[PDB]
Design a protein around this ligand. Structure first.
Ligand code: HEC
Ligand code: HEC
Lengths: 108, 108
C-alpha cells in the first residue's frame, strides 16, 4: 500500500490516549460522542446505525481501508471538511501505522 | 467513493464472458490461470495461497477495495506493470460498476 504494519500494542495505547474519549471499538460497544467503530474496515462512512453523522461525513462516502484511514487521521477536517470530529490529527506516519495496526485487529 | 453500485445480475454475465476463462469466485473454488478470488475485498494483492503470482503483483501490495479494483480493471498492466494477467481492460465505468457490484457480492 503506502501503509505498513506497526505495533498493535503501541496502537492500543494510542487508541486509549487519543480516541477512547469519543469511541469504542468492540462489537456491541456503544456510540459515544463518536460512533462505535467495530467493522469500520470495508464499510463506507456514515453507515453505523443509531448515530447522527454530519451531512459532510455521509456524502463524502469514503470506503474505509487501512490506507484512507491514514490520510484521514492525518487531518480529519482537511479530509472531510465539515466533520464534527474534533481531532487535530496524527502527523507521524509511524503513529498512524501503529494505531491502524491496532484498529485493523480490534475492529474485526 | 468514485464508484457506485450497478446491476449485480449484469455484473454476473460480465464475469462469465470476461473473467470466468481464468478465475473462479466461489469459496472453495480452485485456482485456474488466475487465482480464485473469494475474499479478495480487503486483502492485499498476492496473498491467495497455492498460487504463483508475478513479482509485480506481490510488490505492488494493493489493498483491494471496490475503488482500486475499478482503476485496475480499466487497464491492469497500466496499474500493475509486469502483471501476467492478460486482460486489456473494461473502459466503461458503467461496466466496471456492474462487475464490481457482482464481485462485492459473490466474493464474500
Ligand atoms: C471526540 C473529541 C473525538 C475524538 C478524540 C476522535 N473522534 Fe473520531 N469521530 C468523532 C465524531 C463526533 C465522529 C462523527 C463525525 C461526523 O462528522 O459525523 C467521528 C468519526 C470517526 C470516523 C468516521 C466513522 C464512520 O463510520 O464513517 C472514524 C474512522 C474515526 N472517528 C476514528 C477515530 C480515531 C481512530 C480517533 C483517535 C485518533 C478518533 N476518531 C478521535 C469524534 C472523535
Ligand atoms: C486470463 C486470460 C485472465 C482473464 C481473462 C482475467 N484475469 Fe485476472 N488474473 C489473471 C492472472 C494470471 C492473474 C495473476 C497476476 C499476476 O501477475 O500474478 C490475475 C489476477 C487477478 C487479480 C489480482 C488477484 C490478487 O489476489 O491480487 C484480480 C483482482 C483479477 N485478476 C480479477 C479479474 C477480473 C475481475 C477479470 C475479468 C474482467 C479478470 N481478472 C480477467 C488472469 C486473468
Amino acid at each position: 500500500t503506502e501503509f505498513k504494519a506497526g505495533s498493535a500494542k503501541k496502537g492500543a495505547t494510542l487508541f486509549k490516549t487519543r480516541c477512547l474519549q469519543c469511541h469504542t471499538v468492540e462489537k456491541g460497544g456503544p456510540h459515544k460522542v463518536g460512533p462505535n467503530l467495530h467493522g469500520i474496515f470495508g464499510r463506507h462512512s456514515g453507515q453505523a446505525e443509531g448515530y447522527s453523522y454530519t451531512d459532510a461525513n455521509i456524502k463524502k462516502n469514503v470506503l474505509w481501508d487501512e490506507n484512507n484511514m491514514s490520510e484521514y487521521l492525518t487531518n480529519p477536517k482537511k479530509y472531510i471538511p465539515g466533520t464534527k470530529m474534533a481531532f487535530g490529527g496524527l502527523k507521524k506516519e509511524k503513529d498512524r501505522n501503529d494505531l491502524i495496526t491496532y484498529l485493523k485487529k480490534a475492529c474485526e
